[PDB]
């Protein structure tokens, strides 16, 4: 996947994990990972403008707090990204969105809680693949910030 191609291109350390998706947080479950360490990637539209997207990385069970997410990227509000817009920007399908290897470069924020782990798991860009990566290495590849963007 373009996620794996980017890491290899940039020589970023990572571990590839594979599990069997059966077509019809799967990664935490099937890899026996603590859920706090398994991160999803969600896109949002800045001020509801669906070609100005931004990317948020957060534990799979956490809910994205759109007020916090807006404030983290310096915009007035954010709304959930259109299923279609997200796909054309990322090149990935929902349930397989990697923060890595996206087609379009956008701003990226990682939830702060990521920093309490040595490594975290993010989608490898296809169901059944997970990338394990140091949070600071993920941030360096994406020019990402660490900020509080969740509820609870
Ligand atoms: Hg991203």
Curated annotation (Swiss-Prot):
Gene name of the record? ybaK
In terms of Pfam families, this protein maps to: tRNA_edit
Q: Name one GO cellular component term.
A: cytoplasm
Q: What is the top EC class of this enzyme, as a single word?
A: lyase
Q: How does it assemble?
A: May form a tertiary complex with ProRS and tRNA(Pro), as it can be cross-linked to E.coli ProRS and to E.coli tRNA(Pro) in vitro. It cannot compete with Ef-Tu for aminoacyl-tRNA binding, suggesting it acts before release of the charged aminoacyl-tRNA from the synthetase.
Family that this chain belongs to: Belongs to the prolyl-tRNA editing family. YbaK/EbsC subfamily.
Note on file? Answer: Reaction mechanism involves exclusion of catalytic water from the active site and substrate-mediated catalysis: the sulfhydryl side chain of the Cys substrate acts as a nucleophile and attacks the carbonyl center of the ester bond, leading to the cleavage of the Cys-tRNA ester bond and formation of a cyclic cysteine thiolactone intermediate. In contrast, the INS editing domain of ProRS catalyzes Ala-tRNA(Pro) hydrolysis via nucleophilic attack by a catalytic water molecule.
| The organism of origin for this protein | Haemophilus influenzae (strain ATCC 51907 / DSM 11121 / KW20 / Rd)
Name recorded for this polypeptide: Cys-tRNA(Pro)/Cys-tRNA(Cys) deacylase YbaK
Question: What domain of life does the native source organism fall in?
Answer: Bacteria
Named from the GO MF annotations, one term is: Ala-tRNA(Pro) deacylase activity
Query: Where would you say this protein principally sits, based on its record?
Result: cytoplasm
Q: Which GO terms describe its biological process?
A: translation
Please state the Enzyme Commission number of this protein: 4.2.-.-
Q: What does this protein do?
A: Functions in trans to edit the amino acid from incorrectly charged Cys-tRNA(Pro) via a Cys-tRNA(Pro) deacylase activity. Probably compensates for the lack of Cys-tRNA(Pro) editing by ProRS. Is also able to deacylate Cys-tRNA(Cys), and displays weak deacylase activity in vitro against Gly-tRNA(Gly), as well as, at higher concentrations, some other correctly charged tRNAs. Does not cleave Pro-tRNA(Pro).
Report keywords, A-Z. Answer: Cytoplasm, Lyase, Protein biosynthesis
Cell compartments where the protein resides: Cytoplasm
